[PDB]
Symmetry: C5
Subunit: 218 residues, 5 copies
């Protein structure tokens, strides 16, 4: 309930409840279905691009959501959401398969838990990637592909699905970047290896971008 | 009162009381209203300015204050204030929305708790930002804007307000910097996204500065 | 069996069982044989090659497995595998003898424990090495050798064995690298020092790689 | 007692006593008086100097001492001193007001606790500062001032005092540096802010140095 | 018993025994004598040298050993040696007097404990030092001296013994370095300061090296 959101004791009790029920290390599979993790990257900046080494340095908000209805509560007379340290929660073990640096989280490591069991987590992350930088200094731009999925959970355990297919991230991308975004495409993809049987679901993020205000030869 | 400030046992007891009462992970919403967080950035140094990439590296003291009346005590014959490790306290989950590096805290992670429940927290932070660097080597200078607000609490849970809206920062900015400030303003601002319902309050800090001639 | 894989209470109980049985600081010697650790490096990216200093900066997945039969459970009607924080497990104290930076782990620090007691651990690691970079700009390429073994356990306590002896890592190495891999060979080798006659087993990883576009103008 | 310093059980007992008595988060104020913190910086290395940006990169030993009498014990027949992890002790919340990087501690984080309750702590610290570098290539040299005081305790709670006003740090400063030290002065100084009522005591360390 | 080395339960019990007896924060002084620490550096690489600033960036293995007989056990029918996380053990608080960066430890932080109570600890460390780089491009080479000893324990509490062989230096030093080692000499010395009592033992490591060519 909206009116009761700022009831402190209620929030403290909800946090207590969440921590009693939460299993931070066990996947919240419900009904023998995989955990449906939804992921959508919102690019904030493109900081370094190297066309020779095919490397980019970027900042993005990793919009992440999933359900654990064992965390759910009756919010008819209590807050609808609270913030929770992610150390108290299970969080999907996502990794970018083509990252070449550690994900640097720039933000407080808190998630929102909603009374219906939905969890929202959105770290601001600075990270470097190996991807196709060719064409960045052209009209059509470069297309850098970033693949994100579970590091240890195959598709029967975790499914990683995109939220919105196409965007140009206009509400998020810095107007002061040297670069501009032409399109961001986010699609389901699946990876397997010859060594190892199971398939892994990932989201393949296609970042099409170019140098801004480039001087051309016409 | 200040005459009892160095009563060690009193300080120990106050710290004990604070740790018994404090809920570090719960917003201290009193009277069913948002937590009023007051913030002002005091710029100490401008370390690097890259007009190629529109990036700045700065050091600032983040003066931060709010109230949690449940922490209050009667200081008629006891210390007015004590220092407390911030891990013992709730602290607002502030973030700079246009930061491009982690906030590096340079100073002991302690806050002051006043006997009326007021909390004062002021880390010296070195951090990099993406902001408009155009004009830094002109008379009018550059204007670099930094937006600071709660990362996870919307306006009904936390309000973030500027302590003062206008400053020359003269008491704080390093006289030895190769840069000089023309103005620092701090304004209330609201942020919303099409994806999401609620609004998030922030403080928009506008740093107008130039390379000294 | 895999129909029971998403039974969450079962997963929680396996994790509990593993944590009750696991001795994280004790080598899991079975019978009185050394722990047999299988290791195979899959190179993902070659970030920097410094011909002046003979140094390389690389990213690789360190495919690692060993068994601890005391962790095994009956999985007739329970999950075959779970993910486990490596803090809950013994892991081999592997080190690269010619590393010149710390191994930076880019991925969630989780392992897979299989119901037969097998443990699989595969961190993505960025690390710098001192090695022979000569030849990198030639058809034959450079051969960079990295020796990896236990830091404190001799051959009677831990044996370290390569899996695949030869490969070009085509499933793993980035197509966007300015380098290309000719061959990755991984062989057993033994190290002793005049101070200390006890043999230490290691895998010698020979990375044969070359710069793309070796022929240029000037 | 000299003879008992290496009595290991005695050292373990003292450490146990210290940890039972110590309040690491409470200032050790005695007799309604501020904690007297004595501080002296000894510069070891001047690693980088930038005359354009007025920044220096230095290494120094922060010689720090104070007393907590509640830690004292009778050492007539036991060790006079032991080493203690600082996480078991209260240590002053000192910070350099013009630091522009994190203090990087290069040494084991241990203090010495003396049987009279004196505590000695001396980290080697690498840190960058914003200060006046002009004149560094001249004979008179540059004078870089570094202000060190409590970050959260005002003068009623903690006094920060120099041990020794003048020195050229000869036993400490690297002979192999490309800079040389002319003089290091360390003086009491007091800082007040228009926002806040009380004064904060600090040591102003004036580092007079030049390129060789 | 080496045939009993792989008895897992035996190893678990030894670790239990070590952890019950170990005092990680107390110097293991036996018979009212200083802890006799043996320590020597084995250089693996010289990565960067700057003759202008007199700085070197090197990698070495810190061969370290000492005794704590309270850890001893009877190994007639049990393992002779086990690996132990150093968090479970006292370790000498060694530091380099002329270090200008943190010691970056590149290896698992385990020590070996032997059934006679000997402890062996050998971190691979990358670290930068301020030292005499003059002569590096000459036949005579440079002589960079690195001074290492206890940070807080004087000579009556900890002694250091750096005596070791060096004709095996090519077993350790990288063949791929830009530099070559002429000699590594490691000798006892003592340090005192006018301000303070006691002497602190150190190991003066003289790294005599030159650029190849
Ligand atoms: C696919 O799943 C998601 C998850 C989160 C979001 C999301 C949340 C969101 N906020 C709540 C939130 C939840 C948790 C953490 C941080 N933040 C608000 C807000 C506003 C200003 C700065 C920061 N966060 N803002 C935006 N733009 N997106 C969207 C989709
Ligand atoms: C709007 O909220 C605030 C919060 C703090 C301040 C504040 C506090 C303050 N000190 C107390 C304090 C409380 C806590 C932590 C550190 N410091 C004193 C002082 C002086 C010299 C260095 C350090 N701190 N100094 C200054 N200039 N501003 C002002 C407004
Ligand atoms: C010689 O021993 C090994 C060990 C592991 C592997 C292994 C595991 C593996 N995955 C499972 C796993 C277990 C644990 C941790 C991470 N990953 C799958 C997978 C797929 C996409 C990204 C990540 N991991 N994938 C690949 N290619 N190899 C191979 C040989
Ligand atoms: C104003 O307060 C002080 C505090 C300490 C000192 C002090 C202590 C000191 N040592 C003891 C000590 C205590 C504790 C920690 C480290 N060290 C000896 C020694 C010698 C060689 C390296 C290291 N330490 N050496 C020097 N030069 N100064 C001086 C004044
Ligand atoms: C003066 O005291 C010492 C201590 C250790 C050594 C020592 C130990 C040693 N190993 C055992 C060990 C003990 C503990 C930790 C790691 N390692 C073997 C070995 C071999 C290959 C990589 C790693 N370690 N190797 C070498 N070269 N020296 C020598 C003298
Ligand atoms: C939630 O609680 C309210 C009042 O406490 C009650 O009327 C309502 O039935 C509850 N909802 C459910 C689903 O039990
Ligand atoms: C506060 O404390 C003093 C003495 O400690 C007492 O005189 C007074 O009544 C107390 N209550 C209030 C509300 O001040
Ligand atoms: C495993 O448990 C199943 C399930 O009840 C049972 O049929 C059988 O006894 C077990 N199988 C073994 C021990 O091989
Ligand atoms: C210290 O201990 C000795 C021996 O127990 C005792 O005789 C002496 O009186 C004590 N000193 C003080 C000052 O109490
Ligand atoms: C050591 O232990 C073995 C059995 O554990 C025993 O036979 C022997 O007497 C013990 N003492 C010595 C000195 O070996």
């Amino acid at each position: 309930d909206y009116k009761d959101d700022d009831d402190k004791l209620d929030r403290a009790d909800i946090l207590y409840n969440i921590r009693q029920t939460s299993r931070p290390d066990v996947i919240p599979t419900q009904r023998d279905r995989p955990v449906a993790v939804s992921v959508s990257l919102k690019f904030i900046n493109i900081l370094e691009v190297n066309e020779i080494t095919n490397e980019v340095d970027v900042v993005f908000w990793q919009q992440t959501t999933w359900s654990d209805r064992t965390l759910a509560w009756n919010s008819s007379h209590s807050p609808d959401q609270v913030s929770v340290p992610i150390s108290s929660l299970w969080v999907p073990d996502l990794a970018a398969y083509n990252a070449i640096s550690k994900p640097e989280v720039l933000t407080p490591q808190l998630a929102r838990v909603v009374s219906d069991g939905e969890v929202l987590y959105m770290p601001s992350i600075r990270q470097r990637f190996s991807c196709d930088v060719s064409g960045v200094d052209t009209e059509s731009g470069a297309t850098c592909r970033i693949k994100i999925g579970s590091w240890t959970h195959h598709s029967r355990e975790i499914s990683v699905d995109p939220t919105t297919e196409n965007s140009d991230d206009s509400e998020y991308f810095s107007q002061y970047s040297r670069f501009e975004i032409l399109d961001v495409t986010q699609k389901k993809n699946s990876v397997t290896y010859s060594c190892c049987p199971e398939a892994y679901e990932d989201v393949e993020v296609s970042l099409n971008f170019r140098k801004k205000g480039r001087s051309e030869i016409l």
